[PDB]
Design a protein around this motif. Structure first.
Motif, short mmCIF file in Angstrom:
data_model
loop_
_atom_site.label_atom_id
_atom_site.label_comp_id
_atom_site.label_asym_id
_atom_site.label_seq_id
_atom_site.Cartn_x
_atom_site.Cartn_y
_atom_site.Cartn_z
N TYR C 306 0.80 -1.21 0.00
CA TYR C 306 0.00 0.00 0.00
C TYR C 306 0.84 1.26 0.00
O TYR C 306 1.88 1.33 0.65
CB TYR C 306 -0.92 0.02 1.22
CG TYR C 306 -1.71 -1.25 1.42
CD1 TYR C 306 -1.27 -2.24 2.30
CD2 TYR C 306 -2.89 -1.47 0.72
CE1 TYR C 306 -1.98 -3.41 2.47
CE2 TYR C 306 -3.62 -2.65 0.89
CZ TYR C 306 -3.16 -3.61 1.77
OH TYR C 306 -3.88 -4.77 1.94
N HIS C 307 0.38 2.25 -0.75
CA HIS C 307 1.06 3.53 -0.80
C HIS C 307 0.38 4.43 0.23
O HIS C 307 -0.82 4.69 0.13
CB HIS C 307 0.98 4.16 -2.19
CG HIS C 307 2.08 3.73 -3.11
ND1 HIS C 307 2.14 2.47 -3.66
CD2 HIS C 307 3.20 4.38 -3.52
CE1 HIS C 307 3.25 2.36 -4.38
NE2 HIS C 307 3.90 3.51 -4.31
N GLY C 308 1.14 4.87 1.22
CA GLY C 308 0.59 5.72 2.25
C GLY C 308 1.54 6.85 2.58
O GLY C 308 2.48 7.12 1.83
N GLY C 309 1.31 7.52 3.71
CA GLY C 309 2.16 8.64 4.07
C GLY C 309 2.71 8.59 5.49
O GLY C 309 2.79 9.63 6.15
N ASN C 310 3.09 7.41 5.95
CA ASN C 310 3.62 7.30 7.31
C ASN C 310 4.95 8.01 7.50
O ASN C 310 5.44 8.13 8.62
CB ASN C 310 3.76 5.82 7.72
CG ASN C 310 2.44 5.22 8.18
OD1 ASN C 310 1.43 5.93 8.33
ND2 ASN C 310 2.44 3.91 8.42
N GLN D 218 -6.86 4.50 -0.95
CA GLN D 218 -5.80 3.59 -0.50
C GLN D 218 -5.03 4.14 0.69
O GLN D 218 -4.65 3.39 1.59
CB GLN D 218 -4.84 3.31 -1.65
CG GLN D 218 -3.64 2.48 -1.26
CD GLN D 218 -2.87 1.93 -2.46
OE1 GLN D 218 -1.72 1.52 -2.34
NE2 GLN D 218 -3.52 1.92 -3.62
N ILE D 224 -1.83 0.56 6.94
CA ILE D 224 -0.87 1.66 7.01
C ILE D 224 -0.84 2.27 8.41
O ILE D 224 0.22 2.39 9.03
CB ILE D 224 -1.23 2.78 6.01
CG1 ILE D 224 -1.01 2.29 4.57
CG2 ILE D 224 -0.37 4.02 6.28
CD1 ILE D 224 -1.63 3.18 3.50
#
Lengths: 511, 511, 511, 511
Positions: C306-310, D218, D224
């Motif tokens: 998954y592409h996320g922003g952590n 997503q 995430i």
């Protein structure tokens, strides 16, 4: 070359002495030396009348002792040299009642390369910092350290190597030496000098940006600015005309015939208050440089002394607050230019992040460099916050219920300037790479020198010389990502600006 | 009395028109009117050549519509009058291409007492705000409201009562009316005016404080300041000498023969940058007041128009940041004086919290009043923060990547000035009460008029007149706590300062 | 002793590894190692399907190259060790798809004492800083420098001395190594650790202050705080009771039978939000310490990424903003206590500026020391300004339109903490001298150990040991001004706090 | 419906009483009333033993008089009702020694709709403000004014209309009524309530933005956030999943198969500290709401009274600083979304400035609206500055050397909230117009209700109802620029949010 006592010192004078080791000499004007002696006689004869001599000397000596409470990092040597030059300059006015011999001690330290160690914490705006200089000058104790052309030494040892005898402070001499704004003003002086230089360079960066973006020069037409005649705006517009004169990358429209973002079209209006504000500050600091700041002041002509508060460096405190504020504004404007350059949507046809070798699909150009710039600029606006307004009203037994915070305001300013030197180096790298890519888009080769206005060509070339990357029609400044460590270039450019190298000389006319 | 077109407008001129209803008249100078007509002909003839007429008018009219997006509280009527005065002043330069009839409309509104409603939110530095004035002037729709000497009315109705016909914007007229810095600058102009007045009053307050504390006048001796010749410091010291001249409460020591806290001894040094800073701002605002700020500019002599960025009000944005910063500094200094006055340990003999009737063991004097002052001053330093550096770089489709935040900076400044008027009123109350108690301690009666320097006596009496408490040898300003509502006094004094009443006339010489 | 992979890491764990060189070991838990291998198989098999292998590796390697654009001073070694500890900790979660061999490389560097050089500028919140660590770990080029137990060395040479072969980054490995909040969080972790310690010491200082001022312990009675049950307030009140238990300098009034200024009477109420805020921050940072922050994340159980922003470290950015703000408040409260101690009017009988030998009329006591404290405190409130709100919305080709400024917020916090250690050393010196002079006034001798509460006696004695001045009934800590250089004492105490010496051990129970 | 004395009051309880006029009743619990009477007996019997009775009452009454020194604008009526509710709530604890009859007076005022006028200036954190409430309750003098369901009236006249007799303060009653944090906390309570609501609406705005930008869902996948488990982030991510559930405008990728700017991809990470910070503040404010803040405190069980400092509102002062800081951050993030929506380069295909009727080449859409938003957001970050750290250390004869500035911090927070309501109204307008244009691009018609997720459809329709523009497939919210005054819409939406209308009800589930 720099004589103290005759003419008023300028910021440039202080910089040369502090940074370039320019020799100093006290004036030989008998009238000046007379005044100096005259104020001492006033104090001496005052001791002979109306509370003693030895007791009065012990008091001055003990002042040095309870003030040895500095803390934090040491001030840069250049700032301590500036402080001594200013302290001596103040004394030459003949109103401090201090022996010429003590004033001469500073000339000797400055010329011999002996710099007392001074801490960044201790002054609310400069008793504590000046006590370290005083104690070192008189060789009070081995606890006072100095730098003698390179290595640490105790004051007594330096005085022995200088074939000088320790000194004993006479009445008033302690106060004459430690009461005043010399240190905070010396720091501020160097800050203003460095900021004037960075502002000139920033103008050169904007000139490179305008060309790489194919902006028009119409925004700088004199009719516009004469109709809104703010001196700094007029100056900025006229300087840009000169910086863009004969460029083949700008679209020439001074004849009269919106696409340009405001960062270009409103450049003169934006820089105006900044340029004018820095000029205002310079002027105020130059007065402080030539002011008598100890207390009490001796008025020989009327055989009287007055208790005043010239030791309050409010102009430096607020002046440096404004200076940091102006720097943040300069950086943010420069950062917005970089954003236009790096983005295809706004660069008017330049490669994304100013990528060089499109062939290598892995190259990302100056994407990392923009991020670094984006990390420094906000810090600069953060430093643009003020500190003069945060003065403690309970300071020193509630006696100093108002104080300037001038010392820390100045040290904060030195931090802003040091950071801004790194930021401008980044802005310079973006501007240089950008014009090579624009030149290519226009001519098919990468030698920006064939299209740049002669004024910006000087700056462009100075930067390429410093980083060691010679301009060639075959390749732009940055080709492949793995061919250079951008950090090395930032460091080299910044080092050159700080040393007044070819990059500074290249904009010598914008100062 | 105020003519627009011939000589440059001063801050004083704007204040009179905005606050006092002074009548305005456009100049009759044929050369000026010729220039105005000339720029219109250029645009007209430009429409006759080289994109149409009706389409070009529809565009200008629609500009007024999509700009009707203001929000928040309405601007004070005086600021809107100031904005109109400046907008008209700008048009008289003859480089905007606007019909004399449209300019005249602003003259009529000003003289008739018709003020368009304008919102505080909408400008990043004044399209939106100016669009409300424009729509009102032309009577575009009933949605545009105005104040006609007292009550709300729609623009069309006002135009009918004035026997004026609605107007249709011709090419360029929309931009000429809505492009520019007229509103933010008008607001800033009134702010500078009020601050100059408050600064003068503050000087009068410090003069009362010094006398009540039995301070010495030695700190203001010319020799001290001529040795640290900053113009503001020299000015501050000299003004204090005049304010303290012939006082029987100050210990005269101008002859030369520390006890005084820094807030007194360093007063000139501290106020110097503030006074000089306010003067710098005033000069910059006066240039803005007389500048042409719309776009594009019409250069008839060369039959050309230039696209520039004079609409960026950077001088107003940064100038007001500085102004709020200076106000905060003024207030904190004034608060430190109040602290000396209220505390027996530092008041040099005054009753605690300046209590009046010692007989009533219940009385607590001005303890509550000090607390109120202590609550206002920190707020003023809070407003001393800046906003120019906080501009949004993504503004208006990323086209206005730099903006001045000049509009909100000016509105924030109006908040600072309004708050400072209340604060100064409090400081005035402490000074008046304090001198009565000092006079008593010195002469056995409470008539401070018998010991005050003539200069401060005028201020002292102006205040007593305003609050309605006549000075008497039998009783001081405040005797028993239950005899007056101090809030009413703060309110009356604040109102008199805002109206330019007797308190302001009393310091007319310090301006 | 510190194992990575099994249990969550604590701030204390990070500090030990970063500052004390505590050895680290990766967990042997087969389930953990399995997860690590599993995510790698996902990426590998993903390359075997669906854009190549070698091209995918070149991309990761080039990432290290264009990101080598750091600038400014180097980060302290401890923060780099913390960063490495956190990066490896993050990888052990098995969602990054990075080879155990690369994770092991960090373990080896940490245990071998090899610390890559990392610059303070480059991250907007940590690609750039992490690229330096990455490049050093893999021995990419001699341009990457590291510190190997004392002296500078290039990465390749270090890897040779460690008998390790350079490594080549496989798909995703570059992103797994350089995408994340490890550096800013490692910096933040050490700041929180140090601030918790300084807060405990500050409580001890307030305990010494209260006793020296003969304050009452009634303000800390449980009835008061249980009626206003804020956890931090309750805690502060109870800790003070314990700190003051059995003191012979406090007036015991827990039985119920204003003189004390608010800085003493409202101590629990004032410290409450600070103590609670620091606790909140620690909790948030501990979560960030154990979070997976690279991208994309690999979810093996569902064979998907998954592409996320952590990678956005908002908690660190805002957390450190608050931390600096809390430190400023702690210093200001401490400064007000010192003001009471130094002034006869408010010290309840102590000598002016805590002078020691009244016999020597020249002695001025700690007057200089207070001025130094007065110069440091305002700077701390200056640093309490925020930076998270000043993020640049045009960052990285307008892709990072929001960013946390977490990296610089953390470095700013390190500056605040470093400065606060010097300040607390000054506060400690004032408290120790003060109790000796109070003991004298009470018993006729200067051995405060005979009257101090056992809890503050421990701190008191630890300070005296560190400065090298043994408590004696004959003389207090500071006797004559010329008998010591207070700067040396400030430096020694500060050094002891930073190293976790006896002064820190002395308040081990307040933590 | 709201009973005081039994259970702790919640922020919701205060809001209902303050804004909705919810009736209040004191508890009938005999144990509570007993405690109240018991503390009175303690004071009474204390007067019978060990100062003078009448003299003790005169002192309390005089307190009301010297404290009538407020200034500035009046507080909103709701905040004053909240203050009365909290003051009475504090007294019910039975530790204040105040007559049930005086506590009942506040119940009567609240239920009768009588609100004492209270000024914004006067408290350093609430003697002065509380003195106005006190004086009004007891009907001390006609100078005390109140609002009685609509018009101004003097306190005595109100007490006559209520058939109540003026009251005389007994010993301790003056302090019990005026010592405390009731006003600042009441103000803060309402601010937190409104901010929780605005934060919920902002989440809904982000949901509309994501859909209009065709962002992916997503970024909110549980995997995430469970790997970076900050409670606020987890909460934000989950709420967005719910807000986006069943949307036909988002690209569904919860299966695993960068284009989205950080403002979308990092939304949970960014909002997390904000959401958690607002929750932390709410918890601290609820404790303050139920705390006893007067002094001294009466402990009947031990027949003793203690002097403490519960009147210092540090949690409110620092809490409101944080609250304003959080609001600025929320607004800046929302502004960056508006920037993406307005620019074709980043809106993923939406018309420039969300123009509606492309046919009319004169239409500019929401360009003016964005500018207004760009002018408000920076002001909110400006208000995000802190004030607690700027407390005056010389306050009240130097007795209050620390104070919280909690009152002005709360008033500043009310200003931030009020401004933010206008800002969110603007953000809502952009999101609504944006989804209509996206729906059109996707389906050919403008009825977003056919594609929006049910959760956002509710908000969408609530807004359209409020402005009076019914959604239709034929036309979007804004068609032609001259068809509506956007200012009227901003005003209507803001008014609805403030009143807790349909827009607030629409997001009731996000609270």
């Amino acid at each position: 070359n720099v004589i103290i006592g005759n003419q008023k010192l300028t910021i440039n004078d202080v910089a040369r002495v502090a940074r370039n080791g320019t020799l100093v000499s006290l004036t030989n004007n008998t009238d000046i030396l007379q005044g100096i002696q005259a104020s001492c006689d006033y104090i001496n004869n005052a001791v002979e009348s109306g509370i003693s001599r030895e007791q009065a000397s012990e008091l001055q000596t003990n002042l040095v002792w309870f003030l040895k409470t500095g803390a934090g990092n040491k001030l840069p040597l250049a700032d301590v040299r500036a402080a001594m030059l200013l302290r001596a300059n103040s004394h030459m006015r003949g109103a401090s009642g201090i022996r010429l011999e003590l004033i001469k001690r500073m000339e000797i330290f400055l010329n011999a390369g002996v710099t007392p160690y001074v801490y960044e914490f201790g002054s609310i705006g400069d008793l504590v910092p000046l006590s370290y200089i005083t104690g070192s000058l008189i060789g009070l104790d081995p606890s006072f350290k100095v730098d003698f052309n390179g290595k640490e030494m105790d004051a007594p040892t330096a005085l022995r190597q200088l074939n000088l005898s320790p000194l004993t402070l006479l009445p008033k001499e302690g106060l004459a030496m430690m009461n005043g704004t010399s240190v905070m003003t010396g720091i501020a002086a160097n800050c203003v000098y460095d900021t004037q230089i960075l502002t000139a360079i920033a103008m050169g960066v904007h000139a490179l940006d305008i060309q790489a973006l194919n902006g028009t020069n119409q925004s700088f037409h004199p009719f516009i600015h004469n109709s809104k005649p703010h001196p700094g705006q007029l100056w900025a517009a006229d300087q840009m005309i000169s910086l863009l004169a004969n460029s083949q990358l700008v679209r020439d429209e001074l004849d009269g015939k919106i696409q340009d973002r405001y960062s270009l079209r409103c450049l003169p209006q934006y820089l105006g208050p900044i340029v004018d504000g820095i000029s205002q500050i310079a002027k105020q600091i130059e007065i402080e440089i030539n002011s008598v700041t100890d207390n009490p002041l001796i008025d020989v002509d009327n055989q009287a002394s007055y208790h005043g508060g010239n030791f309050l460096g409010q102009y430096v405190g607020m002046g440096m607050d404004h200076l940091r504020y102006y720097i943040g504004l300069l950086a943010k404007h420069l950062d917005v230019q970089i954003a236009l350059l790096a983005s295809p949507e706004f660069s008017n046809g330049l490669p994304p992040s100013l990528l060089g070798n499109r062939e290598r699909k892995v190259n990302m150009g100056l994407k990392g460099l923009q991020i670094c710039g984006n990390s420094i600029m906000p810090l600069l606006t953060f430093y643009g916050n003020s500190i003069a307004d945060r003065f403690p009203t309970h300071a020193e037994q509630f006696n100093q219920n108002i104080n300037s915070q001038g010392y820390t305001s100045a040290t904060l300013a030195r931090r802003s300037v040091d950071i801004f030197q790194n930021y401008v180096a980044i802005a310079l790298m973006f501007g240089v790479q950008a014009v090579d890519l624009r030149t290519y888009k226009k001519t098919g080769h990468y030698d920006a020198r064939a299209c740049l206005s002669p004024a910006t060509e000087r700056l462009y070339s100075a930067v390429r010389h410093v980083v060691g990357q010679k301009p060639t029609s075959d390749r732009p400044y940055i080709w492949n990502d793995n061919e250079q460590g951008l950090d090395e270039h930032i460091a080299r450019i910044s080092a050159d600006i700080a040393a007044g190298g070819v990059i500074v000389q290249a904009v010598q006319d914008i100062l």
